Amino acid sequence: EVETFAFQAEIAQLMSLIINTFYSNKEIFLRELISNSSDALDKIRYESLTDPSKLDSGKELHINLIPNKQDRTLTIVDTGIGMTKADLINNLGTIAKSGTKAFMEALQAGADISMIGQFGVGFYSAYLVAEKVTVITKHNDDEQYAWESSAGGSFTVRTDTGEPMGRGTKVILHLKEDQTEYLEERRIKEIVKKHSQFIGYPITLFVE
Ligand SMILES: CCCCn1c(Cc2ccc(OC)cc2)nc2c(N)ncnc21
């Protein structure tokens, strides 16, 4: 069963701003997602120092970037802490309300969209480049879920029946038709080197 939910109002407004504003420097979406992955990997690492069993679901702490030209997707995979059902449905949105208001406010005093990560809502930047985002995630204390949204004010969540992932998150960007440059190996390498070159986990850029 697929459950459908309405985003809190501030998040829907943020998403529409990201989709509608003219802003050419879209490449920043990638470092925002890699930074979120990096924090997640930090978190499971720090938690394992006191409970080694938290890594029974996978010891390797890493990030993979996988382009797929056939599906027109770019997927950012991590083996971080992952997200629970309550994170997806409710708590991340709850946390996101304050950062949204602040970011929207800064967007005058003249900030620009690239500064979105300074407000803790950098995930939404995915919508600079993707028409649909699917997030598959598995946290130690919960089941594997799929979250999905094409924006428009709503999102779905369901138990994922796909291939089990151990622990972590996969953010799958279904790219807009004019954003396929982010499938190209040279373009992804250039962005990673420019914006994400000292992430303290191995980043593997898969090739097609
Ligand atoms: C607010 C940060 C934490 C949420 N989060 C994020 C940000 C976020 C926020 C809202 C979302 O809505 C579904 C999805 C991800 N990415 C993460 C990741 N790769 N692993 C673990 N947690 C992640």
Ligand 1: centre distance to CA 36 (Å): 6
Contacts for 93 with CB less than 8 Å, ≥ 6 apart: 7, 8, 11
Give 81 Cα–ligand 1 centroid separation in angstroms. 10
Task: State the CATH number of the domain containing residue 14.
Answer: 3.30.565.10
What does DSSP say about strands 168-175 and 63-68: parallel, antiparallel, or unpaired?
unpaired
Experimental technique = X-ray
Burial 7-23 (b: 16+ CB within 10 A, else e): beebbbebbebbeeeee
C-beta 7 within 6 A of ligand 1: no
- Residue 98, domain extent: 1-208
80 lines ligand 1 (CB under 6 A): yes
Q: What's the reported resolution, in angstroms, to a tenth?
A: 1.9
142 is in an annotated binding site: no
Coil vs helix vs strand at 175: strand
Query: Considering its fold, how many domains does the chain have in total?
Result: 1
Q: Cα–Cα distance between 106 and 151 in angstroms, integer? A: 23
